[PDB]
């Protein structure tokens, strides 16, 4: 039934269909830690959830908040030697940098050696993203590309 964990971070309550998308998006797998992932799990709360336990690993303030872009109902359980020492939870971050790519072809961010960054904005159905550099706002959906 997944695993017992001594100390770390367990992002639980990931919407089923997003756990793989997260472990890819934020480099979570690029580790030498034991990760145990439950894709498609019976929750009742959600019909199906996903769930990731990263042993001997903790997420920062901003780290966790980045997850709300994909997973506001996730719950990040901070665990120290089997104690649920913490139950962290992502608000919108004010900026996601270095993980996204601007939909604008003629933005400077492509050609030059600078990390990307976007001012995050709760608009009126989804979340809008404004590039630091070209300053064009994009639907967050769009930003996650084709």
């Amino acid at each position: 039934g997944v695993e017992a964990i001594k100390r770390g971070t367990v992002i639980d309550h990931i919407p089923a269909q997003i756990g793989f998308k997260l472990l890819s998006l934020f480099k979570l797998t690029e580790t030498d830690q034991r990760i145990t992932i439950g894709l498609n799990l019976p929750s009742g709360e959600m019909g199906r959830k996903d769930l990731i336990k990263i042993e001997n690993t903790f997420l920062s303030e901003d780290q966790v908040d980045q997850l709300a872009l994909y997973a506001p109902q996730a719950t990040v359980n901070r665990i120290d030697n089997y104690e649920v020492v913490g139950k962290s939870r992502p608000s919108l971050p004010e900026r996601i940098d270095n993980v996204l790519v601007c939909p604008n072809s003629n933005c400077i961010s492509h050609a030059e050696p600078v990390s990307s960054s976007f001012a995050v904005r709760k608009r009126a159905n989804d979340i809008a993203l404004k590039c630091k550099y070209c300053e064009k706002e994009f639907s967050h959906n769009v930003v996650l590309a084709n």
Binding site: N106, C107, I108, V114, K132, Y133, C134, E135
Partner: peptide
């Protein structure tokens, strides 16, 4: 003056303490 939007913002990361005045970055500002 530059053809790519964002050139000036990019220039401030590197201009040090020097001000960068934007004469026009593509079709942004």
């Amino acid at each position: 003056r530059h053809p790519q939007e964002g050139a000036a913002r990019l220039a401030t990361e590197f201009s040090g303490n020097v001000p960068v005045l934007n004469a026009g970055d593509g079709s942004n500002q």
